[model samples]
Target: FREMPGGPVWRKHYITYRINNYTPDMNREDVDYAIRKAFQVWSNVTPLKFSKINTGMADILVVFARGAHGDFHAFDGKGGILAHAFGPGSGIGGDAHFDEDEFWTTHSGGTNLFLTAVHAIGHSLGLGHSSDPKAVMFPTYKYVDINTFRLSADDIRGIQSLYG
Candidate 1:
């Protein structure tokens, strides 16, 4: 992931979303909140917002895929590509995919999407990876604050530029 050099650039509009397939380990509500919060973290800083689509409702689809699904990026068992998303565009532009092979958790157990999703959401929101590890858009995974997710100065500044 790479950052779009410049100040915070708000997206044209909010992107709608719908969960592709709910993970069996986590409840629907947990899944919902995790995904929602993931987007909210970026939305709070930028102009972007995500609306939940009831039924077949969403332009950006979030799917949990493992092994070889479609894209060239393949999930390495349960580690690599913990999750991924597309940049702003069309079709599956803002789509998100979580490595189902991982033990998706909201906590420290196994690979956490909470950790990965924030990074993925950043991509979905049009923000690219940051050089700073503190940045949510960082390429590598690291434990972040659970209660108040770290949007980092780079992240805040990045999203603010996009939102404005």
Candidate 2:
């Protein structure tokens, strides 16, 4: 696991996130569950706590979009750049965006929402791509049985270095 430049970590342990919108590819419940579980992956090992809100500004804004959304980084399409998130900061910091062109699903048939979300949320929490292939923060996406998913030790070490 790695850290972003400057090692931007959230100053506070308690953080809030809001899903700006839901993707049509999966049911709303799955989307919510995926996001929640993704956050849990980090919170399970750190002092950080995450809360979801329906209204008002939050530490992180979650949304599903296609092509150029608003940020400098834009979604390419169905196959590339499944999703992205900013490092911790103010304004656009810590927000997550998913590419709507891909068929997002709760299972392995499509891009697993939970798996991709775990990666994106790692960025939102100030984690950079890890060289460890088994790490959740590894640059490439890989699928594991969600029921048996666990963060690699590399991931815990990286995040703990930031928020421990």
Candidate 3:
């Protein structure tokens, strides 16, 4: 799908994110680790650096909620829409939201937080969904081993095209 009108992107080399809250599906540390790992996926491919902030405004505000939790895009419960994120900009532009209806986990056998975050963060960084099925940005959720995870070639090309 890979569509972007070359809209907004972060104007700075360093970026900050805030975890607005946690999901009951996992331990706090696991969620934090998953998000950090997800951010690292993109950070390894660009000059961008990410930091976690406990207070104050942030470039990205991550949250997990159920249907119609304020955003116009109401979640379709357990399976239809796992999560979504905005393209980079200001205010809610870079925020990522996960559906709390699904059981989020650190690895396989559940909705993998790390994998989903990696996909959402691609949008948060201004990359659109990729037509390539192997790409993380493919419009579907799938799980791969965290230790074995690496961006697909198309995924790399898409992101580097924006951030490089």
The weakest ten consecutive residues by lDDT in model 3 span 1-10
lDDT tens digits, residue span 1-164, model 3:
36465565577788899999999888999898889989988888878999999899987788887755787655477876787777854444667888898988886677888877888877877766889888888878767868978888877778777777
TM-score-superior candidate, 1 or 3: 3
- Per-model TM-score on C-alpha atoms: 0.81, 0.90, 0.90
Candidate 2 C-alpha RMSD relative to the actual structure: 2.1
- Give per-residue CA lDDT, model 2, range 42-84, as digits (tens): 7888898899999997877888876566754544667767777
- Please give the CA lDDT of all the candidate structures: 0.69, 0.79, 0.79
Model 1 lDDT-worst window of ten: 1-10
Model 3, position 107: C-alpha lDDT score:
60
* lDDT at position 41, candidate 1: 69
